[PDB]
Write a protein that binds this DNA or RNA. Structure first.
Ligand code: CL
Ligand code: CL
Ligand code: CL
Ligand code: MG
Ligand code: MG
Ligand code: NA
Length: 327
DNA sequence: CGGCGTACG
DNA sequence: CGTAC
DNA sequence: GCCG
């Protein structure tokens, strides 16, 4: 009744089991902070199953037969159904480890391994990190300086303004080039932690060398607070606000038009949706999927796709619009 | 038990 | 090591 | 942690 891969089922942005999925996602996050990738994936997948259900889970029997619910995930749900709280989840939430790893990994430039090393050195607060800049990269320095703004949700209102500004620079860098909104906003989210754009040009090959030209133009307009031949840029942008401005994370990616469907699919996400789709591709269909293409390793050939619809058809999956990829 | 997505900066 | 979905 |  419920297929086992998230790419086999529609997952809307808002759903009927918000509280249950949020709890499982706490345990998933905590597993990641400990390096337990398998447990992170199971808890993420169990959470996603609940997002795909057509109505609220009210009784434990409704978990019977659902993929990715075993003893542990089912006990979490049972406790939430019976008591409104799961003791394990609440213990994680208030733990010094969870709170500090979350605070540290939320920094742009800091991943689990860096956060964990700082944790073991006894560091606990952003001010702890500011006092020891000897230990910070230029990227991490930027992430820490801008941390407060970057912690403030980006709004869909902000996105339209940013896109016009990116389009202006893109059009000077390469007339005819296009800018497409991707990531969470393309899936219908009303706010986000960053804004994701995919850039291409209708004439194959004309996109070569494009992103340095775009970045130089944005920098000359005073709009770049931070950035690093390249085709992906992870920037911090200066975004107007009434009488002031705020820093916003923006990701720019260039793809040749031949690869655009694959890049659009990949950069539209969700992150879990894409991992599940690539796992499905490889394990169920024997095809290797990434944001550049879809490879048949028996015939040693790449599938040509003109659309995301083509890619779903290639993989034998019913098409899901971006708004239903919120796994 | 093995597997757990796959890229670029 | 970090980044992205 | 769960699937196959
Ligand atoms: Cl694990
Ligand atoms: Cl300004
Ligand atoms: Cl990729
Ligand atoms: Mg995003
Ligand atoms: Mg992004
Ligand atoms: Na980070």
């Amino acid at each position: 009744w419920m297929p086992a891969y998230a790419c086999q089922r529609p997952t809307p942005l808002t759903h009927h089991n918000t509280g249950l999925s949020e709890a499982l996602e706490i345990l998933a996050e905590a597993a990641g902070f400990e390096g337990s990738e398998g447990r992170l994936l199971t808890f993420c997948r169990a959470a996603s199953v609940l997002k795909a259900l057509p109505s609220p889970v009210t009784t434990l029997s409704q978990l019977q037969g659902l993929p990715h619910f075993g003893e542990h995930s089912s006990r979490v749900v049972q406790e939430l159904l019976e008591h409104g709280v799961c003791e394990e989840v609440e213990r994680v939430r208030r733990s010094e480890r969870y709170q500090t790893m979350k605070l540290f990994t939320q920094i742009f430039g800091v991943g689990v391994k860096t956060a964990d090393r700082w944790y073991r050195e006894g560091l606990r607060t952003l001010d702890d990190l500011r006092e020891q800049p000897q230990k910070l990269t230029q990227q991490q320095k930027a992430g820490l300086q801008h941390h407060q703004d970057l912690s403030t949700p980006v709004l869909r209102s902000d996105v339209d303004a940013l896109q016009q500004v990116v389009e202006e620079a893109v059009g000077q860098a390469l007339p005819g080039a296009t800018v497409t909104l991707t990531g969470g906003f393309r899936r219908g989210k009303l706010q986000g932690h960053d804004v994701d754009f995919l850039i291409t040009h209708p004439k194959e090959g004309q996109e070569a060398g494009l992103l340095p030209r775009v970045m130089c133009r944005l920098q000359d307009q005073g709009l770049i607070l931070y950035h690093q031949a390249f085709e992906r840029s992870f920037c911090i942008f200066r975004l107007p606000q009434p009488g002031s401005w705020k820093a916003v994370r923006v990701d720019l990616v260039v793809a040749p038009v031949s690869q655009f469907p694959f890049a659009l699919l990949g950069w539209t996400g969700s992150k879990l949706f894409q991992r599940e789709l690539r796992r499905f591709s490889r394990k169920e269909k024997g095809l290797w999927l990434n944001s550049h293409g879809l490879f048949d390793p028996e015939q040693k050939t790449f599938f040509q796709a003109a659309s995301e619809e083509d890619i779903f058809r290639h993989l034998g999956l019913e098409y899901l619009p971006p708004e239903q990829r919120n796994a």
